[PDB]
Amino acid sequence: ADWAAKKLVWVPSDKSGFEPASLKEEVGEEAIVELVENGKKVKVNKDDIQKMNPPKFSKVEDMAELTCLNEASVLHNLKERYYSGLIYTYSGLFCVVINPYKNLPIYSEEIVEMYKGKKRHEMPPHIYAITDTAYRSMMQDREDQSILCTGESGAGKTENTKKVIQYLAYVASSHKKDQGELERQLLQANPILEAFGNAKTVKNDNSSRFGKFIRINFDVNGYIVGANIETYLLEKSRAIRQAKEERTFHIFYYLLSGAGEHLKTDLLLEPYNKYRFLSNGHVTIPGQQDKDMFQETMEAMRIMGIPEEEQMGLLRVISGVLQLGNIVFKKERNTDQASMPDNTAAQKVSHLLGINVTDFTRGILTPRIKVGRDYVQKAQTKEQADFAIEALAKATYERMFRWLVLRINKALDKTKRQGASFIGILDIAGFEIFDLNSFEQLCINYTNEKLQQLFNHTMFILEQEEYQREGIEWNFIDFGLDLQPCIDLIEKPAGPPGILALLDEECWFPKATDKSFVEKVMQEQGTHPKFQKPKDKADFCIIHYAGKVDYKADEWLMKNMDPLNDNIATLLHQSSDKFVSELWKDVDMFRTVGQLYKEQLAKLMATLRNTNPNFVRCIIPNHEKKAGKLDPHLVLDQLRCNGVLEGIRICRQGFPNRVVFQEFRQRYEILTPNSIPKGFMDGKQACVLMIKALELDSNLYRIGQSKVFFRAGVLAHLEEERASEQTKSDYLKRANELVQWINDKQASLESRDFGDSIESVQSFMNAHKEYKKTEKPPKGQEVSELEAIYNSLQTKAPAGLTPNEIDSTWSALEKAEQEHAEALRIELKRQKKIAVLLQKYNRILKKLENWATTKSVYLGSNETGDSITAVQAKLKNLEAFDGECQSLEGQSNSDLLSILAQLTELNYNGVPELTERKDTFFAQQWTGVKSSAETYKNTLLAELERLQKIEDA
């Protein structure tokens, strides 16, 4: 919610690669940030901080749509998708896949149907979409396709290729068991090529040292007709020397430790510590046995259909390749001609390779060179003879490998249906950055530099097609040209000669050394943009797309030498061994590995530039093959190498976040509330009105036909202001509802109509106490939280809605509660005095009512008596009654007038009614008693007269 108020950024993290942090303060070139996780303040460099995407860009399916295009945002987007079960993620053209090390239900036959004919944006990212779009582009555009897969895992890349083939075997097959045979044979060709083409390096225990191009052939109607395997850029130099902790190709160790004693004898095999070509001896591969893998390799060849005598030819040549390194030449006394005092190694080489030892010895020591018309024998130094033997071993192993690829295609492409189109799957060793980068790493990084240039150009063509569809002017040079200077730094023959050209020149001079080669690179190429001096064992640095790479030019001269002895090549072409003769059937030296590498790569790049390229990036999540565990630095390292971040750099420089007109207006109209009329229909002009209301610089946006194209970070800022504006609306809406409640409650508390009853007044007390217990506290909390929101909103206001005005309005409410409760207590005391007076008033009357009634009953008897004294006795009680009434009359009337006077002080309504009730009683009841009292007295006198008359007689 309040994410825009935290100023969240990405800072480097040792544990998690990057982590969120709240930017607090900048001090010059450094910034103070607060780490979200533990709240500790650290100081970091401002150029180490990377912008963070808004939460709306959560688990985006295409990371080219991120508004903040950096490596910290790419890692975060990949991490969240991975832990949510999503291993596929598009990054522009790339299809990034992170190995889940699990069996996911995403490769079902029902999901294959959901991807047929669908576009990338219509479905979640998946290898099926890459395969479908490539297949549909093959049939619509009628041009061949290529799928370039990188990754440093023989398990992840192979499982991705298996999915590509399965999708093609389902969507383009005409007939099941026959529907998976193409995959069945390919899974048998993988171990065969692996033993001869893969090797343990200092960074990968099973690194493929060649490029595999699996072509799926199709007829003119789109049905699969067959498949074959092409290979490129075999690292043949690995056969003669390897770096520390590194092995040559697997097959050498399989044969040396996996062969029985009879095969050892027949192949003249020797222990590990007698072959110079095995630099480090029997380096083992963890969790694997060279002895055991030998059977599996031979097993796969039997399954493939390769006969016994052809497998023996491969083992025999392997033994011959090793024996060449055992030949020792020595410089003789005071003569530059090389000598070979011991011919034991040559006898074994000549026996294993089916040639004559004397022809071989004479052909390396004193070879014939055709001068004019005749063969002229020329001397050879020890160095020339050594390089010739090494070049012969490298060339033989390459010819043996290429023969094996042809032999496997003979099993695969058995029908040779010859299709009209193909989809090629390229599996090449990706970019390599070791602690010590040598000649091999330069050749590898040279290859991937041109492969990444194939990507940048492909993205350039497609992006140029998008801008023209939207009518937006295209003013960009080719994205592949950004990598051209680094490529020309390495490959350019002349003009500014490349590093490979400079190396060739040193290899052709006598006095030249490794130091003199570095001197020529420093002085002739230190001015190059992509060239840098190291800062320090390395000799020079190259700025690849994957960043700066340091190189050490140790032994580069000898590594670049590749002079094929045409004399020995003729001997091997004329070998008596039928297998060796087959390896050297196409034969016929200023010949270098670097120049031979350029041509091989040119053969590959020609193959690829004649196809439509697709790109899939396989990433290892962790080194423990665990599931659901992600190594952030391991992923970051691969992201820097595979060119994912290079594509992210490209669209970061252009307009990467394209937004449809109606979507842009719906999202950001809160920022532009009064610039679009109410009956406005043109959605394109509405965005023009919104952008004009935001003062966005014309360099930040491009208006298209259906979308508006924005630079990077533009949507990040608008999203920030959107959250900043909707939190303001939530404040104003809540502030109005709070003040209107306070005004209404105060207007209610100011009321003084508390009813005219004791139960009426006490009910409003219970309402006032229930208000202060249940209704008031929730509003008081709103006062505090709104003030907190306003102060937060003010750092990153209609009258009455500022915290200072709400605080005063709330105080007037508490003052209204003050007088309300006091007024109720005044009224409750008033209601009780009335009730007590009314009860005491009606008490006096009821006392007089029964007194007026009962005494009138006694008077009604008119008892005079029977004697004169008894009549006067009746007069005694009558005057007592008369004097008693005079006291009871004035006493009650005085108390009744007092109660009426007190009720007038309290402003009682029914005072005139009470006064009438008293005046009625005295005029009716009470005067009737006083009237009946005198009638009795007159009765007591009429009898008192006649009773005295009787006595006188």
Coordinates of C-alpha atoms in Angstrom, one line a residue, residues 429-839:
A429 CA 29.4 -24.2 -24.6
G430 CA 28.4 -20.7 -23.4
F431 CA 30.6 -17.9 -22.2
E432 CA 33.5 -18.9 -20.0
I433 CA 35.1 -16.7 -17.3
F434 CA 37.7 -18.6 -15.2
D435 CA 40.3 -17.3 -12.7
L436 CA 42.8 -17.8 -15.5
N437 CA 41.5 -17.3 -19.0
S438 CA 43.8 -18.6 -21.8
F439 CA 43.7 -19.0 -25.5
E440 CA 40.8 -21.5 -25.3
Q441 CA 38.6 -19.0 -23.4
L442 CA 39.3 -16.3 -26.0
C443 CA 38.1 -18.6 -28.7
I444 CA 35.0 -19.5 -26.6
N445 CA 34.2 -15.9 -25.7
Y446 CA 34.9 -14.9 -29.4
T447 CA 32.2 -17.4 -30.5
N448 CA 29.6 -16.3 -28.0
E449 CA 30.3 -12.7 -28.8
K450 CA 29.2 -13.3 -32.4
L451 CA 26.3 -15.4 -31.2
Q452 CA 25.1 -12.6 -29.0
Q453 CA 25.5 -10.3 -32.0
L454 CA 23.2 -12.6 -33.9
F455 CA 20.7 -12.0 -31.1
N456 CA 21.1 -8.2 -31.0
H457 CA 20.6 -8.1 -34.8
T458 CA 17.5 -10.4 -34.6
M459 CA 16.0 -8.2 -31.9
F460 CA 16.9 -5.2 -34.1
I461 CA 15.0 -6.4 -37.1
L462 CA 11.9 -7.4 -35.0
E463 CA 11.9 -4.2 -33.1
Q464 CA 12.2 -2.2 -36.3
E465 CA 9.1 -4.1 -37.6
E466 CA 7.2 -3.0 -34.4
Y467 CA 7.9 0.7 -34.7
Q468 CA 6.8 0.7 -38.3
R469 CA 3.5 -1.1 -37.4
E470 CA 2.9 1.7 -34.9
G471 CA 4.0 4.5 -37.2
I472 CA 6.8 5.5 -34.8
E473 CA 10.0 6.8 -36.5
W474 CA 13.0 4.4 -36.3
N475 CA 16.3 6.2 -35.5
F476 CA 18.5 3.3 -34.1
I477 CA 21.6 1.8 -35.6
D478 CA 21.9 -2.0 -35.6
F479 CA 22.1 -3.5 -32.1
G480 CA 24.6 -6.0 -33.4
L481 CA 27.0 -3.2 -34.1
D482 CA 27.4 -2.5 -30.4
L483 CA 29.4 -5.8 -30.3
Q484 CA 31.3 -5.3 -33.6
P485 CA 34.3 -3.4 -32.1
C486 CA 34.9 -6.3 -29.6
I487 CA 34.6 -8.7 -32.5
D488 CA 37.0 -6.8 -34.8
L489 CA 39.3 -6.5 -31.8
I490 CA 39.7 -10.3 -32.1
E491 CA 39.0 -11.4 -35.7
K492 CA 39.8 -8.4 -37.9
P493 CA 42.6 -9.6 -40.3
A494 CA 44.0 -6.3 -41.3
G495 CA 43.2 -2.6 -41.0
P496 CA 43.7 -2.7 -37.2
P497 CA 44.8 -6.3 -37.0
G498 CA 43.0 -8.3 -34.4
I499 CA 44.5 -10.3 -31.5
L500 CA 44.3 -13.5 -33.6
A501 CA 46.1 -11.8 -36.4
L502 CA 48.8 -10.4 -34.1
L503 CA 49.2 -13.9 -32.6
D504 CA 49.6 -15.4 -36.1
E505 CA 52.4 -12.9 -36.9
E506 CA 54.3 -13.8 -33.7
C507 CA 53.9 -17.5 -34.3
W508 CA 55.6 -16.9 -37.7
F509 CA 58.6 -15.0 -36.3
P510 CA 61.6 -16.9 -34.8
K511 CA 62.6 -14.6 -31.9
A512 CA 59.0 -14.1 -30.9
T513 CA 57.8 -15.1 -27.4
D514 CA 54.7 -14.8 -25.2
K515 CA 56.1 -11.6 -23.8
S516 CA 56.7 -10.1 -27.2
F517 CA 53.2 -11.0 -28.3
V518 CA 51.7 -9.2 -25.3
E519 CA 54.0 -6.2 -26.1
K520 CA 52.6 -6.0 -29.6
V521 CA 49.0 -6.3 -28.3
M522 CA 49.6 -3.5 -25.7
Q523 CA 51.2 -1.0 -28.1
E524 CA 49.0 -1.7 -31.2
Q525 CA 45.7 -2.3 -29.4
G526 CA 45.8 -0.5 -26.1
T527 CA 43.8 2.3 -27.8
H528 CA 40.9 0.1 -28.7
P529 CA 37.6 0.8 -26.9
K530 CA 37.0 -2.8 -25.9
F531 CA 40.6 -3.2 -24.8
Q532 CA 41.8 -2.6 -21.2
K533 CA 44.9 -3.1 -19.2
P534 CA 44.6 -5.3 -16.1
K535 CA 45.0 -4.2 -12.5
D536 CA 47.3 -8.3 -11.7
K537 CA 48.6 -11.6 -13.1
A538 CA 46.6 -11.4 -16.4
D539 CA 48.2 -9.8 -19.5
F540 CA 45.2 -7.9 -21.0
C541 CA 41.5 -7.5 -20.7
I542 CA 38.7 -7.5 -23.2
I543 CA 35.3 -5.8 -22.8
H544 CA 32.8 -8.5 -23.9
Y545 CA 29.1 -8.2 -23.6
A546 CA 29.4 -10.3 -20.5
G547 CA 31.6 -7.6 -19.0
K548 CA 35.4 -7.3 -18.7
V549 CA 37.4 -10.5 -19.0
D550 CA 41.0 -10.8 -18.1
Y551 CA 43.3 -13.0 -20.2
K552 CA 46.8 -14.5 -19.6
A553 CA 48.8 -15.0 -22.8
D554 CA 50.9 -17.8 -21.4
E555 CA 51.8 -20.5 -24.0
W556 CA 49.5 -18.8 -26.6
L557 CA 52.2 -19.1 -29.3
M558 CA 52.5 -22.8 -29.0
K559 CA 48.8 -23.2 -28.6
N560 CA 48.2 -21.3 -31.9
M561 CA 50.7 -23.4 -33.9
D562 CA 49.0 -25.9 -36.1
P563 CA 51.4 -26.8 -39.0
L564 CA 50.2 -30.0 -40.8
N565 CA 53.1 -32.0 -42.2
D566 CA 51.8 -32.7 -45.8
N567 CA 54.3 -35.5 -46.0
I568 CA 52.8 -37.4 -43.1
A569 CA 49.2 -36.4 -44.2
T570 CA 50.0 -38.3 -47.4
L571 CA 51.3 -41.3 -45.4
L572 CA 48.1 -41.3 -43.3
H573 CA 46.0 -40.9 -46.5
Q574 CA 47.8 -44.0 -47.8
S575 CA 47.5 -45.9 -44.5
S576 CA 47.2 -49.7 -44.6
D577 CA 44.7 -49.4 -41.8
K578 CA 41.2 -49.2 -43.3
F579 CA 39.9 -47.0 -40.5
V580 CA 42.8 -44.5 -40.5
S581 CA 42.6 -44.5 -44.3
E582 CA 38.9 -43.5 -43.9
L583 CA 39.8 -40.7 -41.5
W584 CA 42.3 -39.3 -44.0
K585 CA 40.5 -39.7 -47.3
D586 CA 40.2 -35.9 -47.9
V587 CA 43.7 -34.5 -47.6
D588 CA 45.9 -31.8 -49.3
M589 CA 52.7 -24.7 -42.9
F590 CA 51.6 -21.1 -42.2
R591 CA 48.5 -22.7 -40.5
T592 CA 47.3 -21.6 -37.1
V593 CA 44.5 -22.7 -34.7
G594 CA 43.2 -19.1 -34.6
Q595 CA 42.8 -18.9 -38.4
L596 CA 41.3 -22.3 -38.4
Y597 CA 38.9 -21.3 -35.6
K598 CA 37.7 -18.2 -37.5
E599 CA 36.7 -20.3 -40.5
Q600 CA 34.9 -22.9 -38.4
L601 CA 32.9 -20.2 -36.7
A602 CA 32.2 -18.6 -40.1
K603 CA 30.8 -21.9 -41.3
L604 CA 28.5 -21.9 -38.2
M605 CA 27.5 -18.2 -38.4
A606 CA 26.7 -18.7 -42.1
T607 CA 24.4 -21.7 -41.2
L608 CA 22.6 -19.6 -38.5
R609 CA 22.2 -16.3 -40.5
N610 CA 20.3 -18.4 -43.1
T611 CA 17.7 -19.4 -40.5
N612 CA 15.3 -17.6 -38.3
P613 CA 17.0 -17.6 -34.8
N614 CA 15.2 -18.5 -31.5
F615 CA 16.9 -18.3 -28.2
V616 CA 16.5 -20.4 -25.0
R617 CA 18.5 -19.8 -21.9
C618 CA 18.9 -22.8 -19.5
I619 CA 20.0 -21.7 -16.0
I620 CA 21.3 -23.8 -13.1
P621 CA 19.6 -22.8 -9.9
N622 CA 22.1 -24.4 -7.5
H623 CA 25.2 -26.6 -7.5
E624 CA 23.6 -29.3 -5.4
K625 CA 20.9 -30.3 -8.0
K626 CA 18.3 -29.5 -5.3
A627 CA 14.8 -28.5 -6.1
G628 CA 13.2 -25.3 -4.8
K629 CA 16.6 -23.8 -3.9
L630 CA 18.0 -20.8 -5.7
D631 CA 21.6 -19.6 -5.6
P632 CA 21.3 -15.8 -6.3
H633 CA 25.0 -15.3 -7.2
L634 CA 25.0 -18.5 -9.4
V635 CA 22.0 -17.2 -11.3
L636 CA 23.4 -13.7 -11.5
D637 CA 26.7 -15.1 -12.9
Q638 CA 24.8 -17.0 -15.6
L639 CA 22.6 -14.0 -16.4
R640 CA 25.7 -11.9 -17.1
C641 CA 27.1 -14.6 -19.4
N642 CA 24.1 -15.8 -21.5
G643 CA 23.4 -12.3 -22.8
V644 CA 20.1 -12.0 -21.0
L645 CA 21.4 -8.8 -19.4
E646 CA 22.7 -7.7 -22.8
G647 CA 19.2 -7.7 -24.2
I648 CA 18.0 -6.0 -21.1
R649 CA 20.6 -3.3 -21.8
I650 CA 19.2 -2.8 -25.3
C651 CA 15.5 -2.2 -24.7
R652 CA 16.6 -0.1 -21.6
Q653 CA 18.0 2.3 -24.2
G654 CA 14.9 2.5 -26.3
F655 CA 11.1 2.5 -25.6
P656 CA 10.4 -0.9 -24.0
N657 CA 7.1 -0.4 -22.1
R658 CA 4.4 -0.2 -24.7
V659 CA 1.0 0.6 -23.3
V660 CA -2.4 0.5 -25.1
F661 CA -4.4 3.7 -25.3
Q662 CA -7.4 2.6 -23.2
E663 CA -5.2 0.9 -20.6
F664 CA -3.0 4.0 -20.2
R665 CA -6.0 6.2 -19.6
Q666 CA -7.7 3.8 -17.2
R667 CA -4.5 3.4 -15.1
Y668 CA -3.3 7.0 -14.8
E669 CA -6.4 9.2 -15.2
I670 CA -6.2 10.0 -11.4
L671 CA -3.1 12.0 -12.3
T672 CA -5.1 13.8 -15.1
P673 CA -8.6 14.3 -13.8
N674 CA -9.7 17.5 -15.6
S675 CA -8.0 17.3 -18.9
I676 CA -10.3 14.8 -20.7
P677 CA -13.9 15.9 -21.5
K678 CA -16.7 13.6 -20.4
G679 CA -18.0 12.5 -23.8
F680 CA -14.5 11.9 -25.2
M681 CA -14.2 9.0 -27.6
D682 CA -10.8 9.2 -29.4
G683 CA -8.6 7.1 -27.1
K684 CA -5.5 8.2 -28.9
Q685 CA -6.1 11.9 -28.3
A686 CA -7.0 11.2 -24.7
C687 CA -3.5 10.0 -24.1
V688 CA -2.1 13.1 -25.8
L689 CA -4.2 15.2 -23.4
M690 CA -3.0 13.2 -20.4
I691 CA 0.7 13.4 -21.4
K692 CA 0.4 17.1 -22.1
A693 CA -1.1 17.5 -18.6
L694 CA 2.0 15.8 -17.1
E695 CA 4.7 17.9 -18.8
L696 CA 6.5 14.7 -19.8
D697 CA 9.4 15.6 -22.0
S698 CA 9.0 14.6 -25.7
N699 CA 12.0 12.3 -25.3
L700 CA 10.1 10.2 -22.7
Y701 CA 7.3 8.9 -25.0
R702 CA 6.3 8.1 -28.6
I703 CA 2.7 8.1 -29.7
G704 CA 1.8 5.2 -32.0
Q705 CA -1.2 3.9 -33.7
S706 CA -2.6 1.7 -30.9
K707 CA 0.1 2.1 -28.1
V708 CA 2.2 4.8 -26.6
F709 CA 5.8 3.9 -26.2
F710 CA 7.6 5.0 -23.0
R711 CA 11.3 5.1 -22.0
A712 CA 12.5 3.1 -19.0
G713 CA 11.5 4.3 -15.6
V714 CA 8.6 6.5 -16.9
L715 CA 5.9 4.0 -15.8
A716 CA 7.8 3.6 -12.5
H717 CA 7.4 7.3 -11.8
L718 CA 3.7 7.4 -12.9
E719 CA 3.0 4.4 -10.8
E720 CA 4.6 6.2 -7.8
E721 CA 2.5 9.3 -8.3
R722 CA -0.6 7.0 -8.9
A723 CA -0.1 5.5 -5.4
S724 CA 0.7 8.9 -4.1
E725 CA -2.5 10.3 -5.5
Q726 CA -4.9 7.5 -4.5
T727 CA -3.6 7.6 -0.9
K728 CA -4.4 11.4 -1.0
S729 CA -7.9 10.6 -2.2
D730 CA -8.3 8.0 0.6
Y731 CA -7.2 10.7 3.0
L732 CA -9.7 13.3 1.8
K733 CA -12.5 10.8 1.6
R734 CA -11.8 9.7 5.2
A735 CA -11.2 13.2 6.5
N736 CA -14.6 14.4 5.2
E737 CA -16.4 11.5 6.7
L738 CA -14.6 12.1 10.0
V739 CA -15.3 15.9 10.2
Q740 CA -18.9 15.4 9.1
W741 CA -19.3 12.8 11.9
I742 CA -17.8 15.2 14.5
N743 CA -20.1 18.1 13.3
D744 CA -23.1 15.8 13.4
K745 CA -22.3 14.4 16.8
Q746 CA -21.6 17.8 18.3
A747 CA -24.8 19.2 16.8
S748 CA -26.5 16.2 18.6
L749 CA -24.8 16.8 21.9
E750 CA -25.8 20.5 21.8
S751 CA -29.4 19.4 22.0
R752 CA -31.2 20.1 25.3
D753 CA -34.4 18.2 24.6
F754 CA -33.7 15.5 27.2
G755 CA -37.4 14.6 27.6
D756 CA -39.5 15.3 30.7
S757 CA -38.9 12.1 32.8
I758 CA -36.3 10.5 35.1
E759 CA -36.2 7.5 32.8
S760 CA -35.9 9.8 29.8
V761 CA -32.9 11.7 31.1
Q762 CA -31.0 8.6 32.4
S763 CA -31.4 6.9 29.0
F764 CA -29.5 9.7 27.3
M765 CA -26.8 9.2 30.0
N766 CA -26.6 5.6 29.0
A767 CA -26.4 6.6 25.4
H768 CA -23.7 9.2 26.2
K769 CA -21.7 6.6 28.2
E770 CA -22.1 4.0 25.4
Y771 CA -21.0 6.6 22.9
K772 CA -17.8 7.3 24.8
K773 CA -17.1 3.6 25.2
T774 CA -18.0 2.2 21.7
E775 CA -18.4 5.1 19.2
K776 CA -15.9 7.7 20.4
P777 CA -12.7 5.6 20.6
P778 CA -12.8 4.4 17.0
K779 CA -13.2 8.0 15.8
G780 CA -10.3 9.1 18.0
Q781 CA -8.1 6.5 16.4
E782 CA -9.1 7.9 13.0
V783 CA -7.9 11.3 14.1
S784 CA -4.4 10.0 14.8
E785 CA -4.1 7.8 11.7
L786 CA -5.2 10.5 9.4
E787 CA -2.7 12.9 10.9
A788 CA 0.0 10.3 10.3
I789 CA -1.1 9.8 6.7
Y790 CA -1.2 13.6 6.1
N791 CA 2.4 14.1 7.5
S792 CA 3.6 11.2 5.4
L793 CA 1.7 12.6 2.4
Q794 CA 3.3 16.0 3.0
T795 CA 7.0 15.0 3.0
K796 CA 6.9 12.8 -0.1
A797 CA -5.7 20.5 1.7
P798 CA -9.3 21.8 1.8
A799 CA -10.2 23.9 4.8
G800 CA -11.1 21.8 7.8
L801 CA -9.1 18.7 6.6
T802 CA -5.6 19.5 7.9
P803 CA -4.5 17.8 11.1
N804 CA -4.4 21.1 13.0
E805 CA -8.0 21.9 12.1
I806 CA -9.2 18.4 12.9
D807 CA -7.5 18.6 16.2
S808 CA -9.4 21.8 17.1
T809 CA -12.7 20.5 15.8
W810 CA -12.2 17.4 17.9
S811 CA -11.5 19.6 21.0
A812 CA -14.8 21.4 20.3
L813 CA -16.4 18.0 20.3
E814 CA -15.0 17.1 23.7
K815 CA -16.2 20.5 25.0
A816 CA -19.6 19.6 23.6
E817 CA -19.4 16.3 25.5
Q818 CA -18.5 18.4 28.6
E819 CA -21.6 20.5 28.7
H820 CA -23.8 17.7 27.5
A821 CA -23.1 15.5 30.5
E822 CA -23.4 18.4 32.9
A823 CA -26.7 19.4 31.4
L824 CA -28.0 15.9 31.8
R825 CA -27.0 15.9 35.5
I826 CA -28.7 19.3 36.0
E827 CA -31.8 17.9 34.3
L828 CA -31.7 14.6 36.2
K829 CA -31.6 16.6 39.5
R830 CA -34.5 18.7 38.1
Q831 CA -36.5 15.6 37.1
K832 CA -36.0 14.1 40.6
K833 CA -37.0 17.2 42.5
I834 CA -40.2 17.4 40.5
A835 CA -41.1 13.8 41.1
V836 CA -40.5 14.2 44.8
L837 CA -42.6 17.4 44.9
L838 CA -45.4 15.8 42.8
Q839 CA -45.4 12.8 45.1

